[PDB]
Amino acid sequence: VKSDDVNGRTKMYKNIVDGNHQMEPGMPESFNVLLKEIRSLGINIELED
Amino acid sequence: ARVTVQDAVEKIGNRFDLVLVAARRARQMQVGGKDPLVPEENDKTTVIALREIEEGLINNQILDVRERQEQQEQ
Amino acid sequence: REELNETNSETKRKKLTKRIKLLEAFVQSGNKPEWMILTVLPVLPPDLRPL
């Protein structure tokens, strides 16, 4: 909540308006950004399941 | 307000599932479909859920049994 | 690995055995050695580098 979440920010604001009190983890954007930075340098970024 | 929490800790023992039960009761009360078994006094659902759990009426088995009965009654 | 086992000990043979074990592991891994030498270079997703 107190971090870079955008689509989670909107969902949380809507929930707080509705009184739902729920946050959706998903995955941080900075995680994909660092993955790209790896792909930006000479290494592929691939995450297994 | 209820300043110190010791009764809930004793009622749970592990002290990590007590907060889980309290929050599960609180979320259910906030969404609706449930009634406070303890007499409320115009307070937050968290305090009411904590009081109901500490009263010896709400547990991780009572809630599960009630949910199973509700699901089976559909 | 056999040659390192057949080697006559000391730091040189120790390093050789370490290299042999590392090669055996990297072979067990699906790691292409050529992957260290890059071929196609990714450019930034344009929203990765602000103007």
UniProtKB/Swiss-Prot annotation, chain A:
Top-level taxonomic group: Bacteria
Biotechnology note: Co-administration of salinamide and rifampicin or salinamide and myxopyronin suppresses the emergence of resistance to both antibiotics.
Transmembrane annotation, as ranges: none
PTM: Acetylated on several lysine residues in the presence of glucose.
Similarity comment: family membership: Belongs to the RNA polymerase beta chain family.
Function: DNA-dependent RNA polymerase (RNAP) catalyzes the transcription of DNA into RNA using the four ribonucleoside triphosphates as substrates.
Quaternary structure and partners: The RNAP catalytic core consists of 2 alpha, 1 beta, 1 beta' and 1 omega subunit. When a sigma factor is associated with the core the holoenzyme is formed, which can initiate transcription. The rRNA transcription and antitermination complex (rrnTAC) consists of RNAP, NusA, NusB, NusE (rpsJ), NusG, SubB, ribosomal protein S4, DNA and precursor rRNA; S4 is more flexible than other subunits. In pull-down experiments interacts with CedA. (Microbial infection) Interacts (via flap domain) with Escherichia phage lambda antitermination protein Q; this interaction renders bacterial RNAP resistant to transcription pausing and allows it to read through termination signals.
Protein name: DNA-directed RNA polymerase subunit beta
Natural source organism: Escherichia coli (strain K12)
Gene (name only): rpoB
Complete-protein stretch covered: 1293 to 1341 of 1342
Curated annotation (Swiss-Prot), chain B:
Enzyme Commission code: 2.7.7.6
Gene Ontology terms, MF aspect: bacterial-type RNA polymerase core enzyme binding; DNA binding; DNA-directed RNA polymerase activity
Keywords carried by this UniProt record: DNA-directed RNA polymerase, Nucleotidyltransferase, Transcription, Transferase
Any GO BP: protein-containing complex assembly
Top-level lineage group: Bacteria
GO cellular component: cytosol; cytosolic DNA-directed RNA polymerase complex; RNA polymerase complex; transcription elongation factor complex
Broadest EC class assigned to this enzyme: transferase
Catalytic activity of the protein: RNA(n) + a ribonucleoside 5'-triphosphate = RNA(n+1) + diphosphate
Subunit structure: The RNAP catalytic core consists of 2 alpha, 1 beta, 1 beta' and 1 omega subunit. When a sigma factor is associated with the core the holoenzyme is formed, which can initiate transcription. The rRNA transcription and antitermination complex (rrnTAC) consists of RNAP, NusA, NusB, NusE (rpsJ), NusG, SubB, ribosomal protein S4, DNA and precursor rRNA; S4 is more flexible than other subunits.
Role: Promotes RNA polymerase (RNAP) assembly. Latches the N- and C-terminal regions of the beta' subunit thereby facilitating its interaction with the beta and alpha subunits.
Family, similarity comment: Belongs to the RNA polymerase subunit omega family.
Name the record gives this protein: DNA-directed RNA polymerase subunit omega
Biological classification of the source: Bacteria, Pseudomonadati, Pseudomonadota, Gammaproteobacteria, Enterobacterales
Residues of the full protein shown: 2 to 75 of 91
UniProtKB/Swiss-Prot annotation, chain C:
Highest taxon above the source species: Bacteria
PTM entry text: Acetylated on several lysine residues in the presence of glucose.
Applications reported: Co-administration of salinamide and rifampicin or salinamide and myxopyronin suppresses the emergence of resistance to both antibiotics.
Record note on quaternary structure: The RNAP catalytic core consists of 2 alpha, 1 beta, 1 beta' and 1 omega subunit. When a sigma factor is associated with the core the holoenzyme is formed, which can initiate transcription. The rRNA transcription and antitermination complex (rrnTAC) consists of RNAP, NusA, NusB, NusE (rpsJ), NusG, SubB, ribosomal protein S4, DNA and precursor rRNA; S4 is more flexible than other subunits.
Family according to the record: Belongs to the RNA polymerase beta' chain family.
Function description: DNA-dependent RNA polymerase (RNAP) catalyzes the transcription of DNA into RNA using the four ribonucleoside triphosphates as substrates. Resistance to the antibiotics salinamide A, salinamide B, rifampicin, streptolydigin, CBR703, myxopyronin, and lipiarmycin can result from mutations in this protein.
Protein name from the UniProt record: DNA-directed RNA polymerase subunit beta'
Gene expressing this chain: rpoC
